[PDB]
Design a protein around this ligand. Sequence first.
Ligand SMILES: COc1cc(-c2ccc3c(-c4nc5ccccc5[nH]4)n[nH]c3c2)ccc1O
Length: 262
Amino acid sequence: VEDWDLVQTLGEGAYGEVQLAVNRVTEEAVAVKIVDMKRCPENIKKEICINKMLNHENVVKFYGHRREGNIQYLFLEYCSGGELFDRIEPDIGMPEPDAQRFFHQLMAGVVYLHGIGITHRDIKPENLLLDERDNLKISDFGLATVFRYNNRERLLNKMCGTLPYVAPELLKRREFHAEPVDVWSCGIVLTAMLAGELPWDQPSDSCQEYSDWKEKKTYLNPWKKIDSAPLALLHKILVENPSARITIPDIKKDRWYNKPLK
Ligand SMILES: COc1cc(-c2ccc3c(-c4nc5ccccc5[nH]4)n[nH]c3c2)ccc1O
């Protein structure tokens, strides 16, 4: 019951590759991430550490790890649904009720992380997975880190993530709060699900489409495909001042978030 077969590649990233593994006797399917420390022994130990803490229905499950010399194995829940990236149709997105359900489950997963004192740092559709029942789970904690410990919040100074998803403070400030950055990225993921495109390459004032958003020109692409209710929330998430920006408990009170659709 503990010997597996590497059936197929699933995601060939930088650190290595996620492979599908089927057990020979039970037929049990698991996802194994293969990280070679020779071809980083630091940011791999943090991923394992963080994973062992995590237990939640919107987070991809961690089963254990084997060491086999330098080949590190990450035994993780497999999601047969794939990446949410592949459910976004380019230039159109997806039906609004689907977007709302995936956004609820994303919020739930993120409240949980923010609750355990951890921040993901790289929320995007490629890091969001659907299982068999089409429920969304947050995957890839390779950039994740602790921002509260012993009930003391620590500010971040490392720049990381993916540029079209990254919050503007992360470019501007030397130090910043973790949670607002996560919130911002979820709001980009929403734009993605509802329009089928990203609003900008980065939120820098040297980016036209971002300047157009601060100027409230919601008469252009991205925003004119959205719809006034979900757009009203995006107005509260994609705020340049991290302190003014809506928090999660307040996203849960939002008109579109509580509108029946699905
Ligand atoms: C929860 O922590 C992690 C999860 C993953 C991870 C990445 C990908 C998958 C997959 C997966 N299922 C797929 C189906 C189709 C295409 C690609 C897929 N990747 N299932 N489970 C995963 C788990 C990787 C690193 C982590 O630190």
